[PDB]
């Protein structure tokens, strides 16, 4: 198979506007949502059909009861940066943990805070150490590195556990993740050269402008690959004409291990 | 099915070295405790390995093999006051600890 | 300072008696737990609380029942003791969840005799 990830965000805000929820927590697997948890539901329900169909009531029962408990600690946390921070108002405190299983079956693992969507605090799982950002998350550092058991308990859960959900849960969805839908480009100008495409899945694709037989990523605008809402994704990339020569263009996509050439007449 | 096992009972002589082992086959692996429990008290933390290796403290040291489901609790230099029972739990994928039936660990003085 | 503090240490019931254990920490933990201890197996959970607020079953929920009044106390509710039920109950607490590598606290334990 190709590339993929799981990874699971908590969301923190500490003085929410009126039904806004004070805590979310998503998972992901690749670009899916898979699972979503909010301290108004207080229910972990499932983001994805083939997640619910294979993922008994105890698993959500269990995960359920876990995330009460995670809510109230991410509230003790923002609570304490922001008191030392010596902040008011409203600010946000995040997280991120998961792991990729590359093609070539390598993997990493990654765990990291934020606060008010800056990097806060980064987990580095070979050194088993935390790396802060400034003297508040240096206080931080400081506590969290003197549990040592916490440290190598977090190395074994990015290494192995991570890397063992991540295959179920790809076996689960497999007719979803691990399809592959071509996509359907063309060439206009509207001067510049458009190369558009779309339909395709999975999102990662590289499009790109050749003149001559000769890249120049300086000269080309590229688009964002984007949701279409069917589950394929589009894309484009434009360059612009030169009137004063005669130039040969063409438009490059690569997806999924297949090449394209659009030739422009 | 989940399981944990250790023996039942080990006896031993003052002064001398005693392994007590445990074995498991859960549904992931998220750590193993050791537990020391004497007769009619209640059980206390010894210790937590979620590497493989070895890790001592004090006249105790407790080993893991995640490869093999297997950890040992080695206590040197035993003493009367060792006389206990020690308990294993290991935490499975989704942090639930199952725990061993214990091991009553009795000294010849 | 006292720790995990649970009562009673002893008591004898009649099948059909109603009877609550009662279990406190001082150490501001977030998760609290009620095992049960028996002859030849290991412990198995009742209930468990996994923050204040929260509460759910364990291994054998059939016979009890439980309340997280507060942050700090968690009792154990048998609300027609049965002869199954003589055993060893301890109630435990930990920092946060079940999730990493905190132990668990455990009390001084109650030992309940159930006769017909």
């Known amino acids: 198979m190709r590339t993929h990830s799981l990874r699971y965000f908590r969301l923190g805000v500490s003085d929410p506007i009126h039904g806004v929820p004070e805590f979310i927590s998503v998972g992901y697997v690749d670009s899916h949502p898979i699972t979503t948890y909010d301290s108004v539901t207080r229910q972990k329900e499932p983001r994805a059909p083939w997640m619910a169909e294979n993922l008994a009531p105890d698993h959500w029962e269990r995960y359920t009861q876990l995330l009460r408990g995670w809510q109230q600690m991410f509230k003790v946390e923002l609570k304490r940066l922001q008191r030392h921070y010596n902040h008011s108002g409203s600010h946000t405190y995040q997280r991120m943990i998961g792991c990729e299983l590359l093609e070539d079956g390598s993997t990493t693992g990654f765990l990291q805070y934020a606060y008010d969507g800056q990097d806060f605090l980064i987990f580095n799982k070979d050194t088993l150490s935390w790396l802060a950002v400034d003297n508040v998350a240096h206080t931080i550092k400081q506590a969290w590195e003197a549990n040592q058991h916490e440290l190598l308990y977090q190395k074994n859960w990015l290494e192995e556990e991570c890397i063992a959900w991540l295959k179920r849960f790809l076996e689960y969805g497999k007719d979803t993740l691990q399809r592959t839908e071509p996509p359907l480009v063309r060439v206009n100008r509207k001067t510049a050269l458009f190369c558009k495409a779309h339909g395709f899945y999975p999102p990662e694709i590289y499009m790109t402008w050749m003149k001559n037989g000769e890249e120049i990523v300086q000269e080309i605008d590229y688009g964002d690959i984007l949701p279409s809402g069917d589950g394929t994704y589009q894309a484009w990339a434009s360059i612009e004409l030169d009137p004063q020569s005669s130039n040969l263009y063409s438009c490059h996509v690569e997806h999924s291990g297949v090449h394209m050439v659009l030739q422009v007449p | 099915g989940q399981n944990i096992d250790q023996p039942t009972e080990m006896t031993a002589t003052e002064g001398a070295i005693v392994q007590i082992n445990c074995t498991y086959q859960?549904?992931?692996?998220?750590?193993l405790f050791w537990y020391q429990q004497h007769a009619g008290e209640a059980p206390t933390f010894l210790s937590y390995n979620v590497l493989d290796g070895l890790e001592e403290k004090g006249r105790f040291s407790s080993f893991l093999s995640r490869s093999k489901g297997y950890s040992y609790l080695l206590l040197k230099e035993l003493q009367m006051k060792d006389s206990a029972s020690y308990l294993c739990?290991?935490?499975?994928?989704?942090?639930?600890?199952?725990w061993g039936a214990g091991t009553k660990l009795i000294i010849k003085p | 300072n006292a720790g995990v503090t649970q009562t009673p240490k002893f008591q004898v019931l009649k099948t059909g008696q109603s009877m609550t254990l009662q279990c406190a920490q001082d150490?501001?933990?977030?998760?609290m737990y009620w095992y049960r201890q028996d002859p030849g197996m290991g412990l198995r959970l009742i209930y468990y609380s996994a923050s204040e607020g929260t509460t759910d079953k364990g291994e054998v929920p059939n016979g009890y029942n439980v309340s997280r009044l507060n942050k700090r106390e968690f009792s154990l509710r048998l609300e027609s003791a049965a002869p199954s039920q003589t055993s060893v109950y301890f109630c435990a607490s930990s920092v946060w969840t079940g999730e990493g590598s905190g132990e668990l606290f455990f009390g001084e334990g109650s030992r309940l005799t159930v006769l017909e």
């Open positions: 859960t549904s992931g692996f998220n750590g």
């Open positions: 739990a290991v935490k499975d994928s989704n942090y639930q600890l199952i």
């Open positions: 150490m501001n933990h977030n998760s």
